[PDB]
Amino acid sequence: NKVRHDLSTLSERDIGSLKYALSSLQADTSADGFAAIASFHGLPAKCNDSHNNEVACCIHGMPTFPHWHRLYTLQFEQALRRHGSSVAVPYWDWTKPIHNIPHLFTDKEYYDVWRNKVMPNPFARGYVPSHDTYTVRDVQEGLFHLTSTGEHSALLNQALLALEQHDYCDFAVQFEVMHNTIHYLVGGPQVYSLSSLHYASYDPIFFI
Amino acid sequence: FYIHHSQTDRIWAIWQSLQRFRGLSGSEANCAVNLMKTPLKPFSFGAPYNLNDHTHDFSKPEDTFDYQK
Amino acid sequence: VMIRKDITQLDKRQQLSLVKALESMKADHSSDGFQAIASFHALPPLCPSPAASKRFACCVHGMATFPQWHRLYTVQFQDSLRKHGAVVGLPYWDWTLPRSELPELLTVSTIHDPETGRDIPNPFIGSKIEFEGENVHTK
Amino acid sequence: ENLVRKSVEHLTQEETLDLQAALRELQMDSSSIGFQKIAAAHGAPASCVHKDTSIACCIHGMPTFPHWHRAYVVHMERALQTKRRTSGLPYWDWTEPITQLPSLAADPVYIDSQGGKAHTNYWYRGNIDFLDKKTNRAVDDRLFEKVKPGQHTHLMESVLDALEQDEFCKFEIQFELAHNAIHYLVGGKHDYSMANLEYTAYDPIFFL
Numbered sequence: 272n273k274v275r276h277d278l279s280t281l282s283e284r285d286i287g288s289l290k291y292a293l294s295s296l297q298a299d300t301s302a303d304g305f306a307a308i309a310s311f312h313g314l315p316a317k318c319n320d321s322h323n324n325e326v327a328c329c330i331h332g333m334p335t336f337p338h339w340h341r342l343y344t345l346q347f348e349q350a351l352r353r354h355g356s357s358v359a360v361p362y363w364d365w366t367k368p369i370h371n372i373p374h375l376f377t378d379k380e381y382y383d384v385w386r387n388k389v390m391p392n393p394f395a396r397g398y399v400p401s402h403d404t405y406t407v408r409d410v411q412e413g414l415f416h417l418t419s420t421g422e423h424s425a426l427l428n429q430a431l432l433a434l435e436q437h438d439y440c441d442f443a444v445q446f447e448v449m450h451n452t453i454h455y456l457v458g459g460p461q462v463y464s465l466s467s468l469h470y471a472s473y474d475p476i477f478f479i
Numbered sequence: 480f481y482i483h484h485s486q487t488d489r490i491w492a493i494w495q496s497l498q499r500f501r502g503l504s505g506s507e508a509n510c511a512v513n514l515m516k517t518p519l520k521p522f523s524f525g526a527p528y529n530l531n532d533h534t535h536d537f538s539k540p541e542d543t544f545d546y547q548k
Numbered sequence: 549v550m551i552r553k554d555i556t557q558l559d560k561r562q563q564l565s566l567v568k569a570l571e572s573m574k575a576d577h578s579s580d581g582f583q584a585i586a587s588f589h590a591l592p593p594l595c596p597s598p599a600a601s602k603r604f605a606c607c608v609h610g611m612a613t614f615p616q617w618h619r620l621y622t623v624q625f626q627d628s629l630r631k632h633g634a635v636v637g638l639p640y641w642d643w644t645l646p647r648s649e650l651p652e653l654l655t656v657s658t659i660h661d662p663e664t665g666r667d668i669p670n671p672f673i674g675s676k677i678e679f680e681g682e683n684v685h686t687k
Numbered sequence: 688e689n690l691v692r693k694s695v696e697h698l699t700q701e702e703t704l705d706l707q708a709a710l711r712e713l714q715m716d717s718s719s720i721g722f723q724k725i726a727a728a729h730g731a732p733a734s735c736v737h738k739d740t741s742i743a744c745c746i747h748g749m750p751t752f753p754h755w756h757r758a759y760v761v762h763m764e765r766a767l768q769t770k771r772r773t774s775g776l777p778y779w780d781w782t783e784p785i786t787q788l789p790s791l792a793a794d795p796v797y798i799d800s801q802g803g804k805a806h807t808n809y810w811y812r813g814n815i816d817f818l819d820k821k822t823n824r825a826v827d828d829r830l831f832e833k834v835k836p837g838q839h840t841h842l843m844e845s846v847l848d849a850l851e852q853d854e855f856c857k858f859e860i861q862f863e864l865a866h867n868a869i870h871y872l873v874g875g876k877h878d879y880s881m882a883n884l885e886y887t888a889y890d891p892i893f894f895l
């Protein structure tokens with residue numbers, strides 16, 4: 272049903288579809304909609320039930336953890352598809368060193384269109400309606416990866432080590448940690464960001 | 480509209496095949512050479528209006544005959 | 549070799565794709581989007597320039613170039629549908645034969661594709677003309 | 688004593704934040720002193736010529752033109768002081784090519800330190816109260832930045848020629864033309880923006 276491509280690989284046409292779809296995603300008020308979809312990851316915590324006693328929905332530090340997030344991505348992908356996205360959500364290959372933050376996400380304004388209208392880039396960010404706060408990202412330049420090999424970045428090393436593990440459990444432990452890095456990188460100190468458990472789901476980078 | 484034009488395009492293709500039978504080259508058009516060269520908008524107007532690369536390259540009608548393109 | 553077949557011949561799955569694809573195409577915010585694509589043929593007129601005082605409609609109608617222009621037009625839609633995940637090429641409705649019943653694909657207002665089990669309007673049945681105020685189904 | 692105007696880049700964070708808060712505070716000011724009221728003087732609503740038909744109130748195409756605008760900045764400047772703006776109105780030196788837009792004006796969001804929440808920057812934009820609409824700006828000519836075979840730039844050349852003119856009026860014609868370019872680039876196509884005569888006053892960039 273769907274193919275996933277790298278962000279860099281995405282063509283303008285492909286990205287354009289994504290650009291619009293997210294915009295429409297944002298619009299979707301419904302539960303399927305983005306605002307609702309985000310809450311699945313964390314705050315507000317609906318997880319045990321709507322009841323006051325609540326915990327974060329996502330499973331972390333648990334072997335279930337990769338399962339949950341994997342499922343989570345599909346939810347978005349389906350949402351975009353409904354929205355009319357031509358392609359599966361792209362993944363931002365963190366492992367490779369990043370000369371600069373990907374253009375699709377980075378550009379605050381999505382100028383290109385036949386219309387040549389200027390608009391905000393839904394990809395760039397979103398806001399949290401409950402908090403009525405806005406997403407923010409504090410990123411470290413260090414992310415631009417430098418390494419002796421050059422190829423073997425910390426992420427690459429960490430990911431690879433996890434890769435060599437028959438034990439799933441062992442794999443997950445290593446697997447999750449590598450995953451953690453990006454949240455820290457983008458979020459930075461910002462309370463409302465990827466760095467935060469509850470807030471992080473809001474940023475669109477999350478899906479990528 | 481799309482469905483209809485598809486049929487009409489289909490018949491046009493039919494004509495081309497008949498021409499081949501005739502021995503006239505199907506791709507080649509003898510007539511209205513001047514018009515064929517000119518590119519057709521908005522196909523010629525690429526992005527942002529026309530994302531499609533193929534139609535853009537194809538905008539010249541001369542190129543259009545070989546549907547296989 | 550994308551294949552264009554008679555609309556009647558089309559499979560349910562084939563139909564399925566077209567219905568979903570067009571519907572998604574309708575939604576498509578992009579310039580590639582359906583509403584935008586429609587503007588190519590006629591109003592709003594794009595021809596002199598997308599933004600020009602006097603605009604003319606894109607019709608190389610009444611000219612030799614006419615079949616070529618329309619031929620590209622169809623593919624433009626076809627490519628679009630493919631972006632949507634159209635499995636096949638746009639089908640053709642052969643008017644040449646007499647048809648007691650109008651094609652079901654286009655005719656039916658609601659489509660209850662069995663896979664989803666959900667019922668939605670048939671995007672093929674009509675569209676809405678956004679720029680023209682008439683937010684009516686293309687009648 | 689007298690306020691000093693520095694370049695935007697020169698502004699310190701402390702200085703910038705004062706400015707940040709002040710104008711944002713200023714925006715709130717409903718008074719005629721308030722920013723919204725201040726905007727009216729430049730253009731719409733017009734009431735330049737009193738009882739007779741109104742026209743935009745700003746002298747353009749006239750030698751008076753630099754006088755009027757100069758007066759205009761001071762008016763706002765005074766407003767900032769009410770705002771308790773620490774320093775004078777910063778100026779964006781268009782003449783020098785700039786790799787990027789100025790952070791203060793450019794950033795649509797201003798991120799405070801200490802994990803301050805990200806909010807829209809006041810400098811980024813303002814709203815048009817009379818005509819319910821938000822001002823917007825699009826820079827079609829991103830290219831203007833850093834275009835130069837050397838120190839000399841198109842603006843520099845234009846300004847320089849104007850500079851070499853003893854006659855005030857001769858200078859004005861040349862000078863005014865240079866002035867207009869920024870409005871064009873910033874405003875772009877957008878109807879409500881620097882590009883438009885009436886609307887331009889609303890943008891804070893006009894100020895800089």
Ligand code: CUO
Nearest residue numbers: 312329331450454
């Ligand atoms: O883990 Cu729950 O967010 Cu990546």
Ligand code: CUO
Nearest residue numbers: 484589607609618
């Ligand atoms: O529409 Cu212009 O031709 Cu069938």
Ligand code: CUO
Nearest residue numbers: 745747756870887
């Ligand atoms: O002058 Cu009235 O606009 Cu700069």
